[PDB]
């Protein structure tokens, strides 16, 4: 019987998942980010160390 | 923050610990 | 008879061990030794708990 030079060609549906990836701590940021070039001026060695 | 210039392969380098005085 | 005599180093014993000497002695008894960091952690959860 009969049979076509026939084709194909497509419509659709898709899927995803939400994020992050981790570690989570302490007040350092501010604790001691008041300084930045005057106060601090001898030794805090092993601190910067 | 300063950390960028930053380690891009197996940091090679040393180890703290201390002998106690 | 001489008690059997060719050296340190003639089949296969140093590691049991590694090193470091510790000549100058005389101060310690359960002191310290360290490391900074730690184990293998987390990018597979949910949104995890």
């Known amino acids: 019987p009969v049979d076509q030079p026939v084709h194909n060609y497509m419509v659709k549906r898709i899927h995803k998942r939400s994020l ?3 570690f989570a701590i302490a007040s350092e940021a501010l604790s001691l980010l008041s300084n930045t070039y005057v106060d601090g001026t001898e030794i805090d060695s092993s601190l910067r160390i | 923050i300063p950390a960028g210039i930053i380690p891009t392969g197996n940091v090679l380098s040393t180890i703290e610990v201390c002998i106690f005085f | 008879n001489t008690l059997n005599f060719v050296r340190f180093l003639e089949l296969g014993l140093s590691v049991a061990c590694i090193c470091t000497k510790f000549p100058e002695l005389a101060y310690v008894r359960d002191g ?5 960091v730690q184990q293998p952690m987390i990018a597979r959860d949910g949104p995890h708990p």
């Open chain 1, 20 to 22: 992050s990836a981790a």
């Open chain 3, 32 to 36: 310290v030794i360290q490391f900074e």
